[PDB]
């Protein structure tokens, strides 16, 4: 989801 990208580590 969008939030999975947001929270993910770089």
């Amino acid at each position, epitope marked *: 989801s*969008f939030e999975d*990208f947001w929270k993910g580590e*770089d």
Partner: nanobody
Amino acid sequence: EVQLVESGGGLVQAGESLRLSCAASGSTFDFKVMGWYRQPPGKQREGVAAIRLSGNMHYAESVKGRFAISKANAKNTVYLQMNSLRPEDTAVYYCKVNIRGQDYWGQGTQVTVSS
């Protein structure tokens, strides 16, 4: 005590382009990720685009290809290019940044697209 300053918004004609700007402020520390969410009137808030410090970026499906997010040369500053704007793009646009493990949200700036 990070402060977000959003600029560039306003009331625009369908089919025109608009660039939003967001500068995260009050930190010497680079963000991990930074981006934009938007809230159409009466609807839930949804992510629009995000970019990580590496330059890796992510677009929601509803805007993918139509919007473009990028890092400004300035510390903790990103741009949203909004091209070919349509009335369905009308929304409060919110900047958000994650710095040292904490999320911070801007107050939001209106983008309104007449038909």
